[PDB]
Write a protein that binds this ligand. Structure first.
Ligand code: CO
Ligand code: CO
Lengths: 203, 228, 228, 203
């Protein structure tokens, strides 16, 4: 949104870059930060941890009723069966979308997100626009922003991550996918479907 | 604190800015900002709750429109100064140095295998906040409770939109680090945690969606019994 | 609306900036901004309640740190565009023109005695919002009432800090223009007005001053009876 | 407060000046705004309407018990006896400071102020810092910002102008002023004493 008091994006980036490099130089001299530590953290969240992990959990639940029960009973323990878990996903609670209920997650207080299954959150999830509105006008937000129309008669449950409990949405399995392999089903599971802002891919 | 950061329910923030796709890190400084999280944590700058509090104390105008990772930088500086680990004057001098010489080298340093070990352990092992306490849970599923109207000036996870509101306990998760003490440098002091369901009508009045509910996590001191 | 402008009770805004003294108008543009108030009012751009609503819809970051009179400019533009009296594209073109030519003259125009007459009448005679209604007051001094938890997306004078709170009616002032209708272009629809007393403990919980109370004005629909 | 995203005060003023002159040119062409109308409004609030008017009301109340009763009963009508009233003071309610109670006024929602008796409000009154804090920590604010210490046992009543009713504080008459003329007493009445952020001048 327009703000006549705000500097250009270019000037803002130039200022931040200098401030970060300055702080970095100090933490490096203190011996608590190194270039290898920076590269390792970035490598993990750029190529290792991402929404493909959550998709594996979703498709297993879709094709294994017993695992699905375990997943809904204790998200952390169930995901550990697939070697999935860790930082910012120590406590996970999965919620199941049905014909009567639709779930959507948010962190109104900051940006809390289940990193182990979805990787780092996209910028819109961390921004004030989505966070402020989703708990107040979830139906309108889903339609206007994501083109997702949830019938007035269908309940929308918004989960606000105020604690370390991380909420993840188990989207409904799209119709016309009878007998599909876990790999084929995975192509339908998106990061958005696990946040609850969109259903899993149709067809 | 009643900070602007507590945006749940705030009107007028504008339409969502959402590109079709984006990189995990939009610039090199973001990778550095991100990596400083486990670095400052290990160094004792702060815990997770204190990390959040540092961001909550930001200039609201700066918070609302600055790139996300800049919030992280602000909390590092906040706690670095608080603990005396960061000299502000030296930081300002170095900032100007890098403004004038952006390609100047970073300080010579030795790599440390222990820091990589910490990264791997924190990432894959996690930093669990669950704790065991001697007291049993005061509440249980089905209990109708009311959220506290207390307004601490320090850190807390008491979104203004749920204060004084009545809801139903959905699940008891066990005990966890208590924000009201942890975020204010007063220790873990674990408390039982509960997910509570609040109807949209309860939260927003007639303007609320007639078929929606918000689930919000409440530590034990946050709620009091209405109907068992 | 639940706008950021509704700052009562907000924490972290910083220390008060207060010079030992200051001029009424810090710059010539401020005098112009100020004078546009009666000008746009007379022209039908908006009434007082709509004037406030235009400001409430500002970008929060801009609102919090911009010079006061800039808020007024924003509401003039907002309503000028709303009523179709101001063409945004032409305004943008002229803005650039004056950026490049700050000393360029203003358009030739004739002075109008009627506009001076309006100024004198509004300033010394006032623009009273008190109105007479057929219904008698629903409440009276001493009545214990509770403030509505409604959260209109349009204009209203329902500060978040008093919503759902219980107070005591201090005085009935008669009927006045109702903001919830007036500020949203729905007419005056007058309602009885009351000053209600809320204890600091009721508003802020244990963090409130043990010997303080806040007096807040409530239109009739804003409150419901608890104890007569 | 520091905001790395904010332009300099100089750049902000340059931008605002251009935008205002542009809007002004359009309102002038529409025939609804003129240079004489601008000069007249400014003249009134720069030299005619100010806190000296409120001071006249205060000293009359201090030296006339009957007028004081009328002032507290109906502020608008009482002020009219002195030819004081008008824009943004159509409805005034005066509140009396005593040994047991201290009053302070604010407009948390914007900047509402009794123009007819105090003129236009100083910038701090209209800013977020004062507005946000005074209803929450009035005692601390008065001490820290105005060096005014109000004993814990003395009640502080904060008046939030959410309606057109304009609240004005009638400060207590300072000790050692027995028999002073209204003119002499007026030197002790400040704009701050009528807002409630400071008591009337001592001595
Ligand atoms: Co968060
Ligand atoms: Co106001």
């Amino acid at each position: 949104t327009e703000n006549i008091l705000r500097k250009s994006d270019e000037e803002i980036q130039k200022e931040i870059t200098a401030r970060v490099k300055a702080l970095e130089s100090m933490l490096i001299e203190q011996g608590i930060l190194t270039t290898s530590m920076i590269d390792r953290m970035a490598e993990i969240y750029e190529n290792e941890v991402g929404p493909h992990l959550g998709a594996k959990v979703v498709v297993k639940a879709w094709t294994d009723p017993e695992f699905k029960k375990r997943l809904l009973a204790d998200g952390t323990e169930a995901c550990k069966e697939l070697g999935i878990g860790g930082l910012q996903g120590e406590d996970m609670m999965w919620v199941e979308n049905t014909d009567e209920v639709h779930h959507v997650v948010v962190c109104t207080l900051c940006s809390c997100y289940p990193w182990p299954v979805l990787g780092l959150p996209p910028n819109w999830f961390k921004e004030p626009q989505y966070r402020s509105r989703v708990v107040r006008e979830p139906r309108q937000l889903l339609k206007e922003e994501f083109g997702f129309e949830v019938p007035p008669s269908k309940e929308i449950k918004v989960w606000d991550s105020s604690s370390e409990m991380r909420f993840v949405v188990l989207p409904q399995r799209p119709a016309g996918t009878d007998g599909w392999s876990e790999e084929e089903l995975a192509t339908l599971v998106t990061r958005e479907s696990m946040i609850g802002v969109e259903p899993a891919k149709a067809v | 604190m009643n900070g602007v950061y507590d945006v749940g329910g705030t009107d007028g923030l504008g339409p969502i800015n959402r590109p079709a796709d984006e990189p995990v890190f939009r610039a090199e400084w973001e990778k550095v900002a991100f990596a400083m999280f486990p670095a400052t944590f290990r160094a004792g700058f702060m815990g997770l709750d204190e990390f959040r509090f540092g961001i909550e104390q930001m200039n609201p105008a700066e918070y609302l429109e600055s790139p996300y990772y800049w919030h992280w930088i602000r909390t590092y500086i906040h706690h670095g100064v608080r603990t005396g680990k960061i000299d502000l004057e030296e930081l300002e001098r170095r900032t100007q140095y890098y403004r004038e010489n952006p390609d100047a080298p970073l300080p010579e340093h030795e790599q440390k295998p222990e820091l990589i070990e910490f990264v791997n352990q924190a990432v894959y092992g996690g930093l669990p906040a669950s704790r065991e306490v001697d007291r049993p849970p005061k509440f249980k599923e089905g209990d109708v409770v009311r959220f506290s109207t207390a307004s601490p000036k320090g850190h807390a996870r008491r979104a203004r939109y749920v204060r004084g509101k009545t809801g139903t306990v959905v699940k008891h998760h066990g005990a966890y680090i208590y924000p009201d003490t942890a975020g204010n440098g007063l220790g873990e002091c674990p408390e039982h945690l509960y997910t509570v369901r609040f109807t949209a009508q309860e939260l927003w009045g007639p303007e609320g969606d007639p078929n929606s509910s918000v689930y919000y996590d409440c530590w034990e001191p946050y709620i009091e019994l209405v109907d068992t």
